[PDB]
Amino acid sequence: GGLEDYIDKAMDDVAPNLKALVGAKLGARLISLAGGLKELAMLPSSTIQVLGAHGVIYQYPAINRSPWWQRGKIARALAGKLAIAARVDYFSGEYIAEELKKELEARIKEIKEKYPR
């Protein structure tokens, strides 16, 4: 039983939607940065977008593998999904996660870019 295994398991109990969305380590980092599941669940999302600091969600693959200029938009979309994720985890306890689907889909929208003028 390593540190990481503990947290992976804990996220299974505390916040499985988050965990599904961004993974247990990023999920757990955001909860800590928030101060807890509840506090995370109360945050606007613009606030979520900056929790790490670009806050830690920029480390998100789709953002990082992406042009500056597409990133802030991808951040916003992610933070939103995160805000919903934490809310369902706190208040409802249900399992949505395939708003990854909603989410992918937006990313693909946003990929309407070449470098702004």
UniProtKB/TrEMBL annotation:
<feature type="domain" description="Nop">
    <location>
        <begin position="14"/>
        <end position="113"/>
    </location>
</feature>
<protein>
    <recommendedName>
        <fullName>Nop domain-containing protein</fullName>
    </recommendedName>
</protein>
<comment type="similarity">
    <text>Belongs to the NOP5/NOP56 family.</text>
</comment>
